[PDB]
Design a binder for this molecule. Sequence first.
Ligand SMILES: Clc1ccccc1-c1nnn[nH]1
Ligand SMILES: Clc1ccccc1-c1nnn[nH]1
Ligand SMILES: Clc1ccccc1-c1nnn[nH]1
Ligand SMILES: Clc1ccccc1-c1nnn[nH]1
Lengths: 329, 329, 327, 329
Amino acid sequence: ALKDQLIVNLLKEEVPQNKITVVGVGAVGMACAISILMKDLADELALVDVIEDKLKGEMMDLQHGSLFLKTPKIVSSKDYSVTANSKLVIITAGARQQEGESRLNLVQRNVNIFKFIIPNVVKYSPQCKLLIVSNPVDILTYVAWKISGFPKNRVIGSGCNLDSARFRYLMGERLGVHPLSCHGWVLGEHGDSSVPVWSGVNVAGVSLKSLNPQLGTDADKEQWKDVHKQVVDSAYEVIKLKGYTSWAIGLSVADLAESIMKNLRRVHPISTMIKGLYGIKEDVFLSVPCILGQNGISDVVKVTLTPDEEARLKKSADTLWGIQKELQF
Amino acid sequence: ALKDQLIVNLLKEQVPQNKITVVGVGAVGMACAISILMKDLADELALVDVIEDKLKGEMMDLQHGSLFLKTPKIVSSKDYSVTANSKLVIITAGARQQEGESRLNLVQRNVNIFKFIIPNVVKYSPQCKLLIVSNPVDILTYVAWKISGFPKNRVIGSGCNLDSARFRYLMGERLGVHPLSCHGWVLGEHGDSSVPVWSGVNVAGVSLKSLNPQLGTDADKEQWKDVHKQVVDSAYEVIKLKGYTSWAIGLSVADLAESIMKNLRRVHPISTMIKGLYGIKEDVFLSVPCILGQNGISDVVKVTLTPDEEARLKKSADTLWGIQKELQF
Amino acid sequence: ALKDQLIVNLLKVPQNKITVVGVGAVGMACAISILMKDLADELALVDVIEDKLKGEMMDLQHGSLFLKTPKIVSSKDYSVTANSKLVIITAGARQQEGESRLNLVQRNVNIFKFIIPNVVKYSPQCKLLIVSNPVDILTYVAWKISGFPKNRVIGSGCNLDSARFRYLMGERLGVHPLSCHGWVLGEHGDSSVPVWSGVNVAGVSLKSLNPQLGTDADKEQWKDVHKQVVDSAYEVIKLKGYTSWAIGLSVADLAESIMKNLRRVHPISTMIKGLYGIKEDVFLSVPCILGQNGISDVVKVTLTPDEEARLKKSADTLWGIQKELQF
Amino acid sequence: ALKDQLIVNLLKEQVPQNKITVVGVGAVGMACAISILMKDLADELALVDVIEDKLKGEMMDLQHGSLFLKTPKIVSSKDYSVTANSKLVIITAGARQQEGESRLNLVQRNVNIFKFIIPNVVKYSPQCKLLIVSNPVDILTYVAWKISGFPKNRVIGSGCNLDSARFRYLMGERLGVHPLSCHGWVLGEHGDSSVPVWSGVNVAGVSLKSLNPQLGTDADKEQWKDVHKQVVDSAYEVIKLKGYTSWAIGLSVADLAESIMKNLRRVHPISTMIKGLYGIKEDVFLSVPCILGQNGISDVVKVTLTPDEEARLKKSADTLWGIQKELQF
Ligand SMILES: Clc1ccccc1-c1nnn[nH]1
Ligand SMILES: Clc1ccccc1-c1nnn[nH]1
Ligand SMILES: Clc1ccccc1-c1nnn[nH]1
Ligand SMILES: Clc1ccccc1-c1nnn[nH]1
């Protein structure tokens, strides 16, 4: 054999150390995959879906770029054995928003799919962190948690990481400052009931509300509330124009993957249990600022909300809980 | 204005210094775009296409990921004024091959679009290099060169950079070595007449043909010719499975963009004029190994091919010339 | 030639060139950090110690396989620096054990009378990034000698002090420094001003949770964190003889914003004449928007009366030194 | 407490997953440290040395740059418990060669130091690879191997990775090509008896010796043998000029660290046992091309040498073996 003429093998080796699995090879799944590949986060990437031709085609297309990457093993299968020993399993599969459709409209359809997916993930990577991206992401993080049996620190929703990224982009465009230097937090549901925390919006520690006490109100002369409205509408607008969203959510998820895989303990607004916060007493999942690392969510930042901000957050909690509390599973 | 309360302007405001344009926001174009964005190659990215909604949607989706990137301005329009001052313009627009269709079948459709695209690009980006990705890439590089009035060094076809990356991936899989340490060139047409240069295939400077002189012939017991066959068929197989190719070509183009933008003077197998080499007398464009930097292709490596390999390269040239000489534009 | 047998030539200025002046520990740390961040297509080194300069260039050159900066050059002759987009000045007397950076000022003003006109001659449109100490005064000096408009004369300032502050805060809170926000302004030195009023995590003001934060009345004495920021260079100099790595990374951070036109906000040395009544040409750190044209805009911070008083005192200290210089 | 007002803890600490230790905080050790930090290879970096002030000062200086890095824990101690759970331990401590002094002259000093370092370093890290950088590196890789009792796949010397990087740089300068596209191996001792393998020196798979059969001989009109002489003399030229070498070796070591930490299975010329190749019957360590990944050196490439190249490699082996016979364990 040519291999043996060329190379002397010293030992038969064993398991990857930084393996990531993406479930679902739709547009969101593949954008997560490419972003993760380009950020050199994993030594092995596994893809899983039930559409076998599409799965194999996507795997091959990624594999053919291997020379340009530093992820030496890319694999796929409908069989979850291919996902064994993942540090992080990212769930993106399921029905996706159509034009004008609420993410909440996907709920029972994707719960039903999660009934198959989650036990199969848990079977082969019982120690992984789960990162839920499928919608509605907050409710589906709750579902993944209940079905998996995992402790809550290891079940994370991509949540409002993207909503906040959008907010900071839009704010940066208004101010002529890079989004990295524009700070502001969108919390609650990843969806229509999200909550902009105007009191925390700043550049260089300078509160925009301290310059404009009417920031975010209807009395705001510059209508900054339209920035949050743009955040809310963004996915609908993009779906209308190009049929789906992919690039921004792929980057958002890869950002979360990086914090987890590299144990950074950065703060992200991501989906977790908020029972005990703001007088909430049920197992509601929604985005609050969380310290994210190698053990998932280890700590939550207690954001000081104004009475109105707090009321909006509980309204978001209420909306999610009404659906979550009656799920069939 | 809130902005003026927050910020004192000290300097009247901008011309981009490392601008990249991608023409075409189909799957190849957007794969080039995300790959270029994730490699921090540009300070401005412009997108141009003729489908307005798709174009705006793609632009917006990339923009929403700006927090996670280091490319501070992302713009788009059907108006080529948006592409002004580009250092690199990447042409991906045009018809793409269906299942069972040669890239050579696209030539009439894509020559006719290039008649419009190329003069518009050159109008606003007089310092750019042109990187042709649209197919058939070898003929279209010739066409772009003739239309543009650019010197041949500044008109580059993505060519066999991808075919060679596929070859090296496939070889590495067989050998249990990373593609980076598996060396081998596929030259000629980016298409069915490409040539595997078996004579130069090596690991750590060890020629695989010296270990197995039957390498790449039908008498080869390990059938390494199947590797080149897989390279030839890869686009077709992937199109059969997922409907199109995107990721691998995106990465290949980003690789070439890196060498250009960073003046690396790395060697790539890319489309350039080969008149004067291997007895070729006409203005044939095809892939040979070229030194690639800030002024495009500055130098061509004269590969020492075996008689069969050279015969195969001349046949590739003959095939392209048959089509090329019949073009009217 | 073998080259001509192998290669057919078809074509007989760098676009993203950076020069570092001074190949001391600070300069070389800036050099290696810029190389590993892929900011430049050419790196030029300049110093007056010729063997040291050549050796550092060669040592860097030998790692070229592992870098993406295809030309690394050096000379005592400033012609090597032509066409620089960014020129980083790190040369001069460096801070000594148990001594203020202000103790270096006259010697470094004198060297800047030689360096700056040489830089300006070969790259009249570069941005100047001053790192040599005392950086706030030397930024003013570079500005006066160069004749450049103030946007193109930048001092590394408190970018490092703020990084140190955010590291220490992060260590106290169990959070990455990226998620611990807070600004140190004024002098890059003993009179720096921690802006406790702006310190936050996830937009939550720490001062809102501890109104006395950073004052003597602070039961948890977070003032000790700023004292650590002030003392850091002195401690590191005492322990290893100089500082290099942190400042190299801080400088590379600024060079990234400039070279990539990011328009991020950094606390860096610029003219603050006008701010808080200040009537003289004092340079010190305030939050600045930094990009391809240098400092285009300044963020107007809202300091408490305490913080305002401390910043004016920093301005007074620098001016007191600066007024008695001559060049 | 402010921390408890701000943050709600939800979770009690796992082991680091990608920890690297560097032993020795001289110029080589710190160049390794900064290079590794800037390549995002580790989640924890530990430094060990016996000079306590210098050690603490270097640690602090790195720590202060943490905002600009993605390595969330940097630690140091004279006590080796600080190195616990390392995946890679890099040994740079020891005497260094003076002008006119062979690296081989360092052997008794550095063996005596290794008698202390090696048992201490392996004590706390069951999963570590040992990467030896101290000189004479080949001899000291053998020494580390004998003292540690590790399997040979886990004991690696930085070897000729730098010598080959230098060779490729100088070749690139001669040809006007990036060193990435200039291929060629310097093997054997990292020192005076190294072997330039002319037979493998190529660009784009084109053998330079095939264009000039006199390449690297005294009859070479272009005196390519001087390139190899420059490689041999390089450390001494740099020591003569700046007092020591640091940056190049730092980058070389970080390159090896990358292959190991990311399981890349790239080929590098690094110090390993070559008993069984080229008729060598003793436990000699020297540089040959090795496949490097998460378990160290899993495979060795059997390079095809000319009779003269083989004779030169055996001479290098004889020289190193002679020094191994001087070792006093
Ligand atoms: Cl991947 C997947 C994607 C969509 C629907 C269902 C599944 C599934 N996973 N395990 N069984 N079924
Ligand atoms: Cl962008 C473009 C995309 C597809 C077809 C044609 C064009 C075009 N460019 N200039 N005029 N038309
Ligand atoms: Cl590089 C330099 C470094 C240190 C001192 C002086 C100089 C200088 N530059 N021009 N003249 N002298
Ligand atoms: Cl770190 C070290 C560095 C240099 C010399 C000796 C040592 C040592 N290690 N264990 N005991 N002594």
